[PDB]
Amino acid sequence: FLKVKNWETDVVLTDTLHLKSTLETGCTEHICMGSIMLPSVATKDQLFPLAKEFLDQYYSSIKRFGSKAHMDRLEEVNKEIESTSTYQLKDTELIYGAKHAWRNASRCVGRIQWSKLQVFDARDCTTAHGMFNYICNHVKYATNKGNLRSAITIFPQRTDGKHDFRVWNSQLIRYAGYKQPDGSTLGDPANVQFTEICIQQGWKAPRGRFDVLPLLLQANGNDPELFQIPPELVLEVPIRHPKFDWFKDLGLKWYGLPAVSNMLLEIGGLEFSACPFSGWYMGTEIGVRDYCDNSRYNILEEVAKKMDLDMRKTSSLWKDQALVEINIAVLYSFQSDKVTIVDHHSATESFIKHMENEYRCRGGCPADWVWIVPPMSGSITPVFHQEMLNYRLTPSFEYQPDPWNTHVWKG
Amino acid sequence: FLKVKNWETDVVLTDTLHLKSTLETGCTEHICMGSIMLPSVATKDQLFPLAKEFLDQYYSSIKRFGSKAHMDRLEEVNKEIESTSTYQLKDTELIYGAKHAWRNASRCVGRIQWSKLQVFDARDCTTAHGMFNYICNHVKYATNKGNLRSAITIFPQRTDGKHDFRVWNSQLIRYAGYKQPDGSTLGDPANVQFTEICIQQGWKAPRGRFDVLPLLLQANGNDPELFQIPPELVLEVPIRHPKFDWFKDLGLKWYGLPAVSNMLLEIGGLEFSACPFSGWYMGTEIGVRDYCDNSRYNILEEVAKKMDLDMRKTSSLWKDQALVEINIAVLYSFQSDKVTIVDHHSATESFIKHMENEYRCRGGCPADWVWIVPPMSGSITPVFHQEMLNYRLTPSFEYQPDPWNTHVWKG
Numbered sequence: 001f002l003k004v005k006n007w008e009t010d011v012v013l014t015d016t017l018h019l020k021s022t023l024e025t026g027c028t029e030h031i032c033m034g035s036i037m038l039p040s041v042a043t044k045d046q047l048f049p050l051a052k053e054f055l056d057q058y059y060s061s062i063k064r065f066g067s068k069a070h071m072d073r074l075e076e077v078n079k080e081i082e083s084t085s086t087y088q089l090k091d092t093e094l095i096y097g098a099k100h101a102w103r104n105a106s107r108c109v110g111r112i113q114w115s116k117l118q119v120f121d122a123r124d125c126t127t128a129h130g131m132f133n134y135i136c137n138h139v140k141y142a143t144n145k146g147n148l149r150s151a152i153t154i155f156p157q158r159t160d161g162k163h164d165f166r167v168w169n170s171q172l173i174r175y176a177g178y179k180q181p182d183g184s185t186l187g188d189p190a191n192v193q194f195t196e197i198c199i200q201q202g203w204k205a206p207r208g209r210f211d212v213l214p215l216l217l218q219a220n221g222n223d224p225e226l227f228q229i230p231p232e233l234v235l236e237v238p239i240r241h242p243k244f245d246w247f248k249d250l251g252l253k254w255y256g257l258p259a260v261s262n263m264l265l266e267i268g269g270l271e272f273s274a275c276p277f278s279g280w281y282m283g284t285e286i287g288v289r290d291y292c293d294n295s296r297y298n299i300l301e302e303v304a305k306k307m308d309l310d311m312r313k314t315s316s317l318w319k320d321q322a323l324v325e326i327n328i329a330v331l332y333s334f335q336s337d338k339v340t341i342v343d344h345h346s347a348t349e350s351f352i353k354h355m356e357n358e359y360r361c362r363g364g365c366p367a368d369w370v371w372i373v374p375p376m377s378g379s380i381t382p383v384f385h386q387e388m389l390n391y392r393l394t395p396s397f398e399y400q401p402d403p404w405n406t407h408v409w410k411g
Numbered sequence: 412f413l414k415v416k417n418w419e420t421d422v423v424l425t426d427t428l429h430l431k432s433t434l435e436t437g438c439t440e441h442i443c444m445g446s447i448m449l450p451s452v453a454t455k456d457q458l459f460p461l462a463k464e465f466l467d468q469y470y471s472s473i474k475r476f477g478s479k480a481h482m483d484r485l486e487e488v489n490k491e492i493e494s495t496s497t498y499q500l501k502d503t504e505l506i507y508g509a510k511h512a513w514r515n516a517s518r519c520v521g522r523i524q525w526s527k528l529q530v531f532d533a534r535d536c537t538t539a540h541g542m543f544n545y546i547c548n549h550v551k552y553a554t555n556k557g558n559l560r561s562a563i564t565i566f567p568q569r570t571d572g573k574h575d576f577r578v579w580n581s582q583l584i585r586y587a588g589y590k591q592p593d594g595s596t597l598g599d600p601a602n603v604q605f606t607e608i609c610i611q612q613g614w615k616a617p618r619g620r621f622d623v624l625p626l627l628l629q630a631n632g633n634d635p636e637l638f639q640i641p642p643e644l645v646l647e648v649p650i651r652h653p654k655f656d657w658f659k660d661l662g663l664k665w666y667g668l669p670a671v672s673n674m675l676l677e678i679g680g681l682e683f684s685a686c687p688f689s690g691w692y693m694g695t696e697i698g699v700r701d702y703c704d705n706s707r708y709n710i711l712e713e714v715a716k717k718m719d720l721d722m723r724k725t726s727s728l729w730k731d732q733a734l735v736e737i738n739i740a741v742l743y744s745f746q747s748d749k750v751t752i753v754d755h756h757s758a759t760e761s762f763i764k765h766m767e768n769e770y771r772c773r774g775g776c777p778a779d780w781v782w783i784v785p786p787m788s789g790s791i792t793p794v795f796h797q798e799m800l801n802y803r804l805t806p807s808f809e810y811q812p813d814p815w816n817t818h819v820w821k822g
């Protein structure tokens with residue numbers, strides 16, 4: 001029964017939810033790995049406890065734990081795992097598991113919204129063209145003309161392992177990255193391997209900066225196929241500043257819709273390798289990381305130039321000064337276009353408010369401080385001063401290798 | 412043999428030093444506590460392994476592991492722990508243990524300087540007046556007319572537990588905190604309990620803001636006594652800005668010398684409860700935390716006012732904008748007065764450079780990411796992108812309770 005403190009408010013919360021945790025963190029009693037970025041087919045013996053555990057808390061959730069329908073559903077799944085050595089979720093079980101994977105995502109500061117999620121059951125899908133159709137419907141729905149709405153699209157579960165639905169893009173909407181003859185990089189350096197895989201598969205690149213990539217969709221373990229998202233469905237925010245008119249001349253823009261596609265959704269021991277989920281941006285992921293990581297767009301040089309800043313010295317904080325201006329601009333631009341975005345102050349406050357709820361009506365909230373704390377102005381946000389217990393609860397979103405590293409090709 | 416990655420540079424380092432770790436982190440395989448702020452008399456049975464371990468690595472250090480002088484010193488300490496159930500360090504062992512406590516301080520970003528430390532052996536001290544004399548000599552030396560130099564002053568080790576040397580101040584130089592009739596707080600809210608303990612012991616407060624506190628010095632477990640550091644030894648930097656002339660009218664100032672006094676130094680199983688250590692400031696501890704924590708001086712309201720900023724909305728980032736300006740001012744002011752200070756960019760770079768050294772010539776470097784990452788502009792500093800293994804090596808600096816919570820008074 002562990003205790004977490006907030007040192008800005010002296011609020012104390014007691015955590016008993018971590019007791020239900022099952023999987024391992026990477027840490028031991030004699031070494032903490034809380035800052036390691038990635039922490040490291042299934043038999044039917046392994047599958048029933050996972051279905052049992054999941055189904056016990058799903059029925060416990062709708063205030064019908066143990067009754068007739070529960071014992072029947074345990075027997076039902078038990079029988080089906082005998083018959084097929086897998087099983088199939090109810091539409092309701094699928095929506096519970098999804099929402100709860102997000103709920104348990106300990107690196108996610110947006111989780112106050114975990115219950116307002118739209119689940120698109122795509123488990124009838126059989127082809128890359130069918131995948132393309134489902135994804136476009138996702139983008140159109142979630143985008144909602146800038147009034148963004150959270151959603152996930154769930155393609156068929158892994159079965160054997162050699163018939164896996166995968167979206168090879170990291171995000172449904174990502175800008176291309178091309179290297180140059182002079183070793184420099186145009187576009188997003190993050191995506192240069194994937195941009196060239198698409199070119200390898202016959203993409204015809206417009207070789208500029210903010211080039212929306214095509215989807216590469218793998219269906220039933222087959223070789224993946226290229227599909228360009230119709231551009232009318234790709235909402236983009238051009239970035240201007242509410243003071244600096246030269247900021248328009250910078251010619252920056254980002255897409256409205258963050259939609260992660262390269263993650264694995266685990267529900268009752270069943271693995272969905274294709275499960276793109278979308279919400280909206282916290283401002284910092286664009287202005288700080290995307291725009292200012294040295295290995296990303298890396299624009300601190302140019303914004304500081306136009307700001308007329310002392311760039312000779314490290315200690316002028318010219319990087320810091322241009323970093324605040326850049327994030328003022330992303331927020332201002334997104335908001336003037338009525339496109340949903342949250343600032344790192346409002347986002348982190350809501351997450352403390354969420355934390356109170358989870359500790360009250362659930363007895364805890366797994367949280368990864370290293371990822372929860374925004375990448376600028378850390379300690380003026382309330383989560384800096386908030387102790388967080390990290391533990392792994394299921395249903396969950398897991399990392400998975402890139403398909404081109406694992407795919408036996410044959411074509 | 413664990414591996415840590417840097418994701419900005421793709422540099423990889425292998426850690427075998429953590430194997431020598433002994434004490435526990437608070438984390439288990441199923442729960443990470445890397446963001447909990449505090450992680451929770453000794454018999455002669457317990458003391459020899461600790462002396463043995465320490466002495467084995469000290470002789471291993473001067474390239475004389477196992478030789479005659481080593482076996483004699485093990486026998487010597489062994490015999491003395493039989494005779495007294497404690498023992499005494501050589502002047503050289505005391506300097507090694509001190510430097511290495513700092514070296515192993517995993518929350519310290521300044522550790523590239525760990526070998527350049529001045530050890531003042533105060534183990535002959537017997538009185539609060541003697542403590543006062545040693546501390547003033549520390550301040551004068553370490554301050555060095557603004558060309559700051561690192562030092563530690565080590566008072567006699569804990570023996571029984573009821574005769575403890577303690578400095579009741581958190582830092583040798585701290586500004587006073589007074590509450591008001593209207594519940595507000597003048598000075599440093601952090602120190603309000605300690606400011607009133609001093610007033611309780613007859614301090615005569617000048618009840619303003621930046622009131623240097625008196626020392627409260629406990630000697631050989633006796634009741635502590637008040638001594639005002641001669642003000643000529645208290646170097647102070649008035650804070651101005653290199654653009655905003657109204658910044659002078661803000662009337663801010665900080666002391667040059669950070670000198671922690673409330674920590675416990677552990678060497679070969681021997682506990683020094685009074686061991687004030689001093690270095691110099693990273694700019695952010697003043698501009699970000701001291702000046703802008705909500706529960707500290709909390710000046711973001713006033714700087715943003717004078718900056719003429721949109722304070723209506725959270726999403727204007729007016730807090731962020733005034734936070735960069737404030738830290739530009741602290742650095743600029745300290746540097747114009749030739750008083751040593753480091754900026755959070757230079758400090759964090761040096762710590763990566765230090766990390767390379769420790770992994771090369773020592774096989775590892777314990778590091779606490781939660782504390783290493785500066786509290787503003789986190790991800791534009793190179794330590795944001797650097798994985799860090801945290802583990803507890805000894806010699807070490809440990810937290811300890813406040814004396815007024817533990818002191819059996821009798822006066």
Ligand code: HEM
Pocket residue numbers: 101102105107108109110111113117150151152277278279280281282285342347371397
């Ligand atoms: C609703 C608005 C949302 C906001 C403001 C938000 C915010 C964030 C942010 C800032 C991060 C850190 C990402 C990074 O720095 O790489 C993150 C991570 C994450 N989010 Fe949320 N998110 C939202 C919606 C969602 C949804 C709908 C899901 C799942 C259905 C989700 C699941 C996750 C997961 C699993 C991570 C961890 C990813 C990783 O470990 O790389 N989020 N979120």
Ligand code: HEM
Pocket residue numbers: 512513516518519520521522524528561562563688689690691692693696753758782808
């Ligand atoms: C030489 C210049 C130094 C710099 C720039 C520096 C920097 C820092 C900073 C910024 C912190 C975080 C403090 C906080 O946020 O509360 C810290 C913590 C710490 N420093 Fe260093 N420091 C220096 C010297 C020293 C010395 C001389 C020692 C010991 C002999 C030391 C031992 C520690 C310890 C033990 C902590 C952890 C304190 C805690 O857990 O509360 N440092 N340092």
Ligand SMILES: N=C(Nc1ccc(CCNCc2cccc(NC(=N)c3ccon3)c2)cc1)c1ccon1
Pocket residue numbers: 258259260277278279280281282285
């Ligand atoms: N893995 C490498 N880099 C790498 C790759 C990925 C990451 C994590 C990035 N997740 C992106 C992400 C996840 C979750 C939420 C958001 N944002 C939202 N707001 C949102 C999006 C959808 O809903 N809400 C963004 C971090 C580093 C690597 C390996 C070798 O080199 N680089």
Ligand SMILES: N=C(Nc1ccc(CCNCc2cccc(NC(=N)c3ccon3)c2)cc1)c1ccon1
Pocket residue numbers: 669670671688689690691692693696
């Ligand atoms: N413990 C509480 N607060 C609290 C108390 C202390 C801390 C840690 C503060 N260490 C101060 C510190 C330690 C080490 C280095 C520096 N700086 C230097 N540059 C330097 C100083 C000397 O050499 N180098 C500063 C954090 C929070 C509490 C309990 C109840 O309420 N509050």
Ligand SMILES: C[C@H](O)[C@H](O)[C@H]1CNc2nc(N)[nH]c(=O)c2N1
Pocket residue numbers: 034035036037370371372418795796797798799
């Ligand atoms: C080394 C470190 O673990 C790595 O930089 C992490 C730190 N915290 C992060 N936090 C978020 N939200 N996103 C990230 O990519 C990272 N990267």
Ligand SMILES: C[C@H](O)[C@H](O)[C@H]1CNc2nc(N)[nH]c(=O)c2N1
Pocket residue numbers: 007384385386387388445446447448781782783
């Ligand atoms: C809750 C959290 O552990 C707490 O705010 C920590 C975070 N990191 C820190 N880092 C430093 N350097 N100093 C601090 O006081 C803290 N406080």
Ligand SMILES: OC[C@@H](O)[C@H](O)[C@@H](O)CO
Pocket residue numbers: 190258285286289290293296
């Ligand atoms: O929204 C996530 C952003 O794309 C970045 O933070 C990535 O983590 C890589 O920099």
Ligand SMILES: OC[C@@H](O)[C@H](O)[C@@H](O)CO
Pocket residue numbers: 601669696697700701704707
């Ligand atoms: O130098 C340390 C500063 O005094 C603060 O960071 C304290 O941690 C409390 O805010």
Ligand SMILES: [Zn+2]
Pocket residue numbers: 027031032033034438442443444445
């Ligand atoms: Zn841990």
